[PDB]
Amino acid sequence: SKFQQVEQDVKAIEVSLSARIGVSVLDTQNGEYWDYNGNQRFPLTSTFKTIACAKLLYDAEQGKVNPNSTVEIKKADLVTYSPVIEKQVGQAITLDDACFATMTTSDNTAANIILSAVGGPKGVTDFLRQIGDKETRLDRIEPDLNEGKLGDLRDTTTPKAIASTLNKFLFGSALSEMNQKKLESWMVNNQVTGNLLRSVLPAGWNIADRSGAGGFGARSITAVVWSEHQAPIIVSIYLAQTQASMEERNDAIVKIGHSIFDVYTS
Amino acid sequence: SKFQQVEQDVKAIEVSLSARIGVSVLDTQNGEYWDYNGNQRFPLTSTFKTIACAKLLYDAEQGKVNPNSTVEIKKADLVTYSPVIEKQVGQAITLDDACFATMTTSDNTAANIILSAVGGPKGVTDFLRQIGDKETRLDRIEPDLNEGKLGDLRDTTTPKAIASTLNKFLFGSALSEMNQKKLESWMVNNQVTGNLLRSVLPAGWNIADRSGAGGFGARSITAVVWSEHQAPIIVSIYLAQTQASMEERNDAIVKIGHSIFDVYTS
C-alpha cells in the first residue's frame, strides 16, 4: 500500500522492457518488508562478490586463512575486465587487497582469487546454507557464472534471499563488528555504481552497494541505505531476460530506487 | 614507437570485438601526439556533453545567458536516464545545476536543457567551428543522437578532433581561468566512470573525464590526466559497430588506458 507506487513503476518497466523483474525491500527498524516476484530466481552476476568476501573475513576470524597472505598473478589467470589485477601480472596481492579490488571495481580476476581461497563455488554455497540462505547458490567462477540462461538454476538467488543474506552479514552476528565494518566499507567505497541508486540517493543519506550485469540482459543491485534519522533499509533489484540496452536497464533501476526512496522521505 | 604496445593492444581489440576502434593521445608538455584511426568518424554519444556546458560558461562570460537562471521541469520533457531531473518534476533548476547534473551523472534531460539554452545542436556546432574544430558536429538532441548508425555523419567526431577541442577548452584561452576550473571540476567530479580509465589510473594521478555509450555498440571516453610530475595528457578512445557486451567494451577501454598510462610511467 505504502509501496503501491513502487509496484506500478515495476509493472511499467516489466512491460516496456519485456523483462522479468524482481524486487525486495527490508526495513530493519520495524520489521516491514515488501517484494515483487521476490521468490523468483535471477542470476547473481556480480552481486555474489559480497558473499565471497564476507566468507573471507569470516573464515579469517576462525583462523582458517590469512588475508595478509598473498597470491601471485600469472598472465594466464586473467579473465575479461580485471582493471586492478591486469596492472600486477608478476606481482603478489593480499586477499584483503583482492577483496578491496573486486568489491570496489568488480575486478573479475580478483573475484576468482578470493573464490579459490574460500573453497570455490561449493564453499560459498555451503556458507550461505549455514547462515540460513536456502535459495542462493554459486556454481561457477568468472566468467561463465554470468551466462544468465533461462531456467538455469546455477548462479542464482531470489531478491528476498539475498536481501536477507546481506541483512545478516552487516547487522547480524555472523561477523565481528570490526569485520562488519570492513565489509560495509568495501561496499560504501564502490566506485562503479554512481549511475545506479547513488544517483538518486536523498541528500545526506549513506549507501553500501554491489551491482551486477550479465547475460540475456541481466541487471541487478543489492544495497543498504541509511541516515541520521532513517534506520538501514535493504534493497534488492534484479532484471533478467531482456533485450533492453544497458542504458534502459540502468534507467529502470534508478526509477525503482527513487520510488523506493520516496516511500521513506515523505 | 613509444606507443607501439598501445597499438598492438588496439589491433587485438579491433579483432576480438570485430569493431572499429579510434584513439588519439596529446602530450601537452612537449607537443607529442599519437593516433590510431584518429581521423575516422565515431558517434559522440555523451562525450558531447562537455562541449555544451563549455558553451554555457563561455556564453555566460559574454553576457548572453545567466547560469543562475532556472528552467522548469515538466513530466513530458523527461527522456530515458535522468536520475537528477526525475527527482524534480515541478521544480526549477539553475543551468549551472543542470550542467553539474549532466556532467557528473550524464542525466539526459539535463543535457537537453543545457542544449536549449545554448542555441541547440546548431549552436554547439557553430561554436566548435569558432574554436577551430572542423570535424565535430551535433545535429540531434537526446536520445536520438545516440543512434550511431553506419555512415551517418550526424553527432560524430574524430578521436583527434575532440581531443584537440578538449585541449583548447581546458588549457587554451577561450574561457576564463575560473571557468576552465569549473569545467575541470565538472569533469573531475564525474560519478559514472569509475569502471573506465579511473580504474587503472596510476596512484596519485588526477583525471577529468567524460564517457559515452550508445547504438550498435558505440563506447567512448575523453579524458585529461595529470600529476605532480606529469603535465596534462589528453586521451580520446572511441569504439563503434560492435556486438560486444558492455563489459567487453569496458574491458577494451581499461586495457588501452593502461597501455597509454604505461607509456608515461616507465
From Swiss-Prot, chains A, B:
The lineage of its organism: Bacteria, Pseudomonadati, Pseudomonadota, Gammaproteobacteria, Pseudomonadales. SUPFAM superfamilies: beta-lactamase/transpeptidase-like. It comes from Pseudomonas aeruginosa. The gene is pse4. It catalyses: a beta-lactam + H2O = a substituted beta-amino acid. Belongs to the class-A beta-lactamase family. GO terms for molecular function: beta-lactamase activity. This is Beta-lactamase PSE-4. The class A beta-lactamase family has a specific amino-acid numbering system, sometimes called Ambler or ABL numbering and often misspelt as Amber. A multiple sequence alignment was used to derive a consensus sequence and then the consensus was numbered taking into account insertions and deletions. This allows use of identical numbers, e.g. for active site residues, despite differences in protein length. UniProt always uses natural numbering of residues, hence there appear to be differences in numbering between this entry and some papers. Hydrolyzes both carbenicillin and oxacillin. It comes from the Bacteria. Pfam families: Beta-lactamase2.
